[PDB]
Symmetry: none
Subunit: 183 residues, 2 copies
């Protein structure tokens, strides 16, 4: 039932969904170690092996599905409403995905086609060590930036200098994240 439900969820997740889920699972599953993962079930099983997903522990799966906005799957297969996930995640300490990862992913959510192209151009202005192609989405760019150690939890300078020239909303996402690190 449980395994069958996990797999069931996996059948409804597409390639974009998978890419997003793997990006959001970076605090626990290293990016190197993600490219054997070819579908959502493999990701789920990798999470199972890390005891971050089991019959009595569905929290991380729910958080993942909520973050990538698959509310339909939450309802259908996990009988969980968005209101519940909101109440749960806003409570300090319950979120298992770091605020940094969520911040980057939300930026990726807000950026359009043309804004993505602008991001690439502006980044190519700001840095030359990043290897960029035009099939890359924003997440891939983030991964490349981290690979080049110009992006990290406490290094947002280039990210902000780029985003400020694209849309104030992105910069506000960063600024908000940056200031609830008051901790």
């Amino acid at each position: 039932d449980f395994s069958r439900n996990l797999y069931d969820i996996g059948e409804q997740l597409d390639s974009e969904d998978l890419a997003s889920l793997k990006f959001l699972s970076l605090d626990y599953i290293p990016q190197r170690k993600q490219e054997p993962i070819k579908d959502a079930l493999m990701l789920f099983q990798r999470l199972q092996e890390k005891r971050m997903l089991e019959e009595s522990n569905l929290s991380f799966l729910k958080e993942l599905l909520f973050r990538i906005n698959r509310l339909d799957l939450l309802i259908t297969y996990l009988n969980t409403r968005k209101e519940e996930m909101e109440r749960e995640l806003q409570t300090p300490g319950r979120a298992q995905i770091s605020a940094y990862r969520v911040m980057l992913y939300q930026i990726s959510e807000e950026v359009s086609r043309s804004e993505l192209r602008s991001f690439k151009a502006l980044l190519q202005e700001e840095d030359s060590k990043c290897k960029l192609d035009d099939d890359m989405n924003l997440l891939d760019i983030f991964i490349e930036m981290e690979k080049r150690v110009i992006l990290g939890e406490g290094k947002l300078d280039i990210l902000k200098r780029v985003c400020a020239q694209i849309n104030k909303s992105l910069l506000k996402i960063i600024n908000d994240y940056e200031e609830f690190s008051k901790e």
Copy 2:
């Protein structure tokens, strides 16, 4: 095109942007003439009537947008890069906003939440004439301080005594400004 472009810039400016722009326009537009201004387009038209903004004169608008860090709008609607604005504004005599106003605004840029609360507490220690609430941002506090004539171009004592107890960076902004009024 030009008017329609002005409105276009105006749509992207939020309440925070408006407040900042009105603060930075204080050398030309008196504070009591700013509260009929309900949006950015009204500010732009007020500038037009002072012939500080027209089709052949976009410098002040550019300086304003640059100062409040709307580089995205400069690029999108004014085809102007950060590099150009920096080169232009470092040039002696080119800036139309007084160094005093820019100094105060930069202080407002650097101050966080808790630093703002500290600012209010420390100012209430330093003075009893200022009427302060918890909805006031730092700009509003500056306006109140000027209204009470404890803050001005040649009166920074209270400002410095407060800022020294919050963060050395702020005090450095003040000191730098204060001594490049050497001439």
